[PDB]
Amino acid sequence: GWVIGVDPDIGGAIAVLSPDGSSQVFDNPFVHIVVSEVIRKRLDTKSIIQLLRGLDAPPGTTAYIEKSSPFPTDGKQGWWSTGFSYGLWIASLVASGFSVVPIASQTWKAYFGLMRSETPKDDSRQAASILFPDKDQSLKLKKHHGRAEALLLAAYGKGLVLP
Amino acid sequence: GWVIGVDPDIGGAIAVLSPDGSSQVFDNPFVHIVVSEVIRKRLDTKSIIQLLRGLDAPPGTTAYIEKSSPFPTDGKQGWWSTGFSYGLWIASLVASGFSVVPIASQTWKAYFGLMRSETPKDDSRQAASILFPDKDQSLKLKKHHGRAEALLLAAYGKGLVLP
DNA sequence: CAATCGTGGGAGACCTTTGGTCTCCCTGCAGAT
DNA sequence: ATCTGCAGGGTCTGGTTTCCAGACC
DNA sequence: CACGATTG
Ligand SMILES: [Mn+2]
Ligand SMILES: [Mn+2]
């Protein structure tokens, strides 16, 4: 039936698949905040919760969420934000009645044969245009890869296959 | 009327202050989970949300939460965990109808004179015992420092003063 | 189970299959149009 | 406003402040 | 602070 996919990161997105085959994808809401005399994007908690309350996906719907897995060579700040974004989404999803299943990125990539691409982001947008042709207008910019990760995650939990 | 204090860490706690002067403090609910073939404690999102749902504190109540601010000499795992707890708690608090106010540890410590102690944790329990005498038995143990921090954050937003 | 200490650290999934291998982001910031 | 590239990074309060001291998990 | 470890 209904499936939710969540790319939890700052350029990420939430994708919702209804049982009639239609689909929605939203950019993750963010705000600009001061940290240590610079400005930085942080997910917008209030907006995210308002969004999750405006979905028609019923309680108990499974939200598939990409497990943040920072590399040992990423910075401590990178570790912090990805932990923070992840906790914010998990808690907002659990609080809004949705069932949360974390999925490793290697899981949904191998499912769609996206492993070992020279152009992984480009390829994700292309595979999501294929799976969701009405969204292809909304998938043409490189910055849109996060929308494509969400849609693909949702595609994975829903069982869809590339043609 | 009502004030909430949150020490969002694994050994932290949530403290709720009534207008009638009573107080409760709960340990943060955790679960043991597998990470990279070892066992690690993580906050329990479902138990947290349930706890927040059963509190008498009415909506709009302010929760004062300690800003996580890890040290640069702390490891990337510490940065990830603190960021995640923080995000889990903020999101759970906003979804439970409460208004979240982040408070740095320098701020409430300065407020209660706790700065630059040799035994910061002991002093916190002692200060929380003086402010919440009926919690005196809940602060006997050295591992009870999280209950203290949580209570002191709530006393801070409450405008309480030491004798 | 309650304290203490000391350094600061990947994690995941699937095969080669009980370990060995291999794969995966992101943040933050500085120039680039 | 989108892009790219590349290394991996503290953050906070407050001061008779315009950066910096001194503090914190 | 986390993360492992020891030590009661
Ligand atoms: Mn993403
Ligand atoms: Mn604490």
Residue numbers in the entry:
A (entry chain B), B (entry chain A): 109 to 271
Could you pull the original sentences from the published paper?
Holliday junction resolution is a crucial process in homologous recombination and DNA double-strand break repair. Holliday junction (HJ) is a four-way structured DNA intermediate formed during the homologous recombination. Canonical HJ resolvases introduce two symmetrical nicks across the junction center by functioning as homodimers, and exhibit strong structure- and sequence-specificities in HJ cleavage. The RNase H-like enzymes, including RuvC and MOC1, typically feature three or more conserved carboxylates, known as the DDE motif, in their active sites.
HJ cleavage was initiated by incubating the crystals in a solution supplemented with 10 mM Mn2+ ions for various periods. The first metal ion rapidly appeared within both active sites for approximately 15 s after soaking in Mn2+ ions. It aligns with the A-site of the two-metal-ion mechanism proposed by Steitz and Steitz30. The single Mn2+ is coordinated by the pro-Rp oxygen of scissile phosphate, the carboxylate groups of D115 and E257, along with water molecules, forming an irregular coordination geometry. In comparison to the ground state, the binding of Mn2+-A triggers a notable conformational change of E257, while the other residues mostly remain unchanged. The second Mn2+ emerged at the B-site by approximately 75 s. This sequential metal ion binding within the two sites might be attributed to the more solvent accessibility of the former compared to the latter.
